[PDB]
């Protein structure tokens, strides 16, 4: 994906993180586990919700077929009528199917973006303090305890 | 000691499409296309449709004797009519500007039928002998119930001069007709006079109908033809008839009252004893989806119709294997 | 010592929408929808419209006596006509294929009226007595100015045989009519002959009109009816009339000269003494915006009409609080 | 935003930079101030101008309603006529509103992209020379004077 | 020692457009618009079109003597007709509901002409004298080949009573006409009777035509007029004629057999002796492109028509200088 | 471009790499040359192929003009007929031209993305081992031989 994080340098997702869409796994002497990053997850929930509502709504004014009848010697206007109704139904079908295709691709990339931005935010903090492993993980030069871990998550390291 | 950034996976099997990739499995997705209906014709918003079944709009309005089910029908939400209804135009002919009438009906929810010219109002003409075996009722030659087939009395058809005034505040659908016999002697037998006319006038109508004789195929055991005309008579307007024969005179006409949103659906389905907020010719729709793919012609609060087999939005992220 | 990368903010309050977010404040933005008009009907590109005001296209073309304002009108840019003009069809009737004519007019900027049959050309018929109180002028029974209501002379209506040849190089709009009396004796009083016809032919026309008698409502204190017909007579073609009564004969017909781009606007607005490059039925547009939301029907160099309340493009970046 | 710079790791914009869309703030012993990066700003001005013209232009051929009249017994074709005109006006309204929505989102992301690319271009040069602060800023290990600062801007550090 | 990441360049000159930038040179690109045709009218999928050349659909169906090329034509794929064909309606008039017929033809690939009323079937009427110098064949006054101009015999036009039954299983296009003379004495000379009619009936038709006399311009040296009518006669249905003059009687009528997909193209091009899978009025298309910009009206397996001058997709990357 | 690699920090492409769309140039004592990265190139070939087919296909149901004729006194319906046919042909022309414009821009950015992701994948591996030159290139602190180079390409450095 465009941002290279999802199924990119981060090989796969976490069945064990049910808490939210993105976050951290930590692992030290006291143990290990998952913690959803609440705000980036919330930003993403907002984005996607607004998008869907935009999508639904933009499509609410849209061609309505009206039943209309013609006699045996009105074949030209009957056909015109038919070609017209079908014509709009095809335009709207295309509008709808494409909007879905494009926005689906934009949604997936958005998630990738949010993961990468989160990754970078943590990378920025660690500095020379940790070895960037290449896989989404940072291995500390020294001894990170649970409140050390918490400090990374909370945004107040060092 | 180690901290990692990562993202959600789950057991989800839901797939979405993109431009560059098809069937991408995602953690969450929103389907937005309604694919289901109940396959019934239902009341709309409580209000039952007019279901003609066999009868056509013509068979109904003129009062085909087999269409007695519809002598007096309540406010309807929509009208349903089969593709090829059997009970219409029992005595063969035409219905003038039928489609423009059907169209007028689409913006009408209630008719109230009132007598404009009484059958027992014809002093000089025979008004109980205008019947045909093409229009049987309970085994006996009968005729369209709302019009009167006027016929010669004591061997005379005196020039008719009749005129109805619309004192009602509601618009009135007045229907009449003309009989086209198949030869010279039939004219004689029925009306006496050999050359005739029906003249009809309102404030905007200027009509003069003259019977067309021709020999033609026996549709319903009949070579004669009826041709039916209609007008909409405004309030405080009068309709003036003048004829010396071949006249199919109004008995009843319909007050146009309700003027509701409405359609004539083509469907071979019968009433299903249900209620809905959105009806299609194939069945009703109960859904909160923005779109449906059921049928283009709907009535009610409906989703938007599209031709798709599938509309699914990704909401979650690419689910990992 | 320190160097930073950063971006612009300003005091801008302008907001744009996106799919995922609404009302994003941006540093710069371009509005592309014109929301404003001047609420006037104006000259287009210098050239004044034909503003009928009360008169209808019918009232104008036939020459309704109350439509003298329009006896001879210059090249117009567009035509304006009210929803329900009072001055049309002063003597009640119909105007045959009126809408096809209105349509022909939309591709016409200039008419030049010329006399084709002179009033003082009728030797055998009374041509100054064809008047009605339905069409008053300065208090006196008058009539459509461009046609002549031919009437019996010394108690005779000799068969008329008149024929005009289009020697002009410009197409000609010829108009005529037929009177439909309301009873047998009126025919007698006006024309003598009881059964009549008007036959009209050109190279492509093959017409025969026959008066329809019927008793009908007094529209404008009148039960009689006029019915008006028209043709377009090509260059080097002739129009041949033949009638023994009920004939409303041409006096004048219009040369079609300019053939400009044009429309008939429906508007209850009067002339505003302004000039514009783009006119709508609601007012004129002076704008460089690509779009406007004023009214769908425009004429001129116009922006594209859309139904939006708002079209704003981001040009700058997300403005920071 | 997708590129994480604007209202991302760079908390907010600069009221004090009127010179252009993106650039630098510097701060040393000789003083401090803003300097617009002329070329990335110009690239962006081009992009946005072309876009608007593309947008306006793509929309120039577009359904024009033609006034058309029908008698009392031509109700079916009058309605057809109406449903047709309305139908196109709805298609074009949707086309226009959506194009605006999507491109607005693309424009904002473009600016984010340009900021991030500028940031990275500077990051590349500094190397071990400066501490990457996390906020858009680089703090020098040694003593950067005004021509040292200029050298970063101009693209010729070290 | 050094390792670098990088991307492809090549000598490519192909450019694509984007929203923000025009003419971006790319390494690879796919053109998807077909701009080329062969400028010929060709057989479609082996099956040759009906190319009328000069003749009109009218000139062909009625059997204009100059349209002998088309007396009996095979199954065609499509029909080509010039903008203003010379050989149609040799004797001036009208063709009733011509466009509805043209439309019916668009869903028809094969006609088979059969005799319904034999010329040597008229006992009481002269059937070899109904000719005109307006319709010459090899220098001699002739007439539409498929209809018969019935004329008085020994100074009498007995009332015709003729009737054809459609025993064929295929629908039948029956054509007939009426002559409109230009004065009273012409009626006398041709038919004897002064007032006439043609009545036509089927199971659904109820017609009565009455000749219209008028003096009119000499189109093709003729002031008389012919007016042609048609019907589609179902299987097991009969068509009943009755007339005492002015009758243009069927000799031949067409069995409708094939009922293929088809169109009438307007083109001034002649046959090109080629085969194609997709034909336009300007030339044929042989292409695998999804789109073409040649002409909107096509028949066959065709690309989608768009108005573009250029449709090119980037596939490769921005090519470097 | 959005990802800053193509005609970004990587000044221009490689006439000498005919093997594929993206890859490596190496240069040491044993010599030098180009090697296409087979999988990122293949991922890109798939993406673009699917896109084109999506694009072609989405456009396959689309308004077909039907020849239709009208007499001299049917001018209103003739015009309606014309305005209808033209109206759809304009809607589809716009649909087609815009889809091309937008997707062209998305395709170019996709290539940029793929280059940047490849760059980052290599950057991740090198660590303190090589000097990131700023231009797409990494200069080794020590002595990289052909199988050392191969190890970088293959994804198994160190």
Author numbering:
A (entry chain F), D (entry chain F), F (entry chain F): 1 to 158
B (entry chain E), C (entry chain E), E (entry chain E): 5 to 325
Excerpt from the paper describing this PDB structure:
The complexes of wild type and Glu186Asp mutant HAs with LSTc showed similar features and indicate only weak binding. In both structures, there was clear electron density for only Sia-1, the 2-6-linkage atoms, and two or three additional atoms of Gal-2.
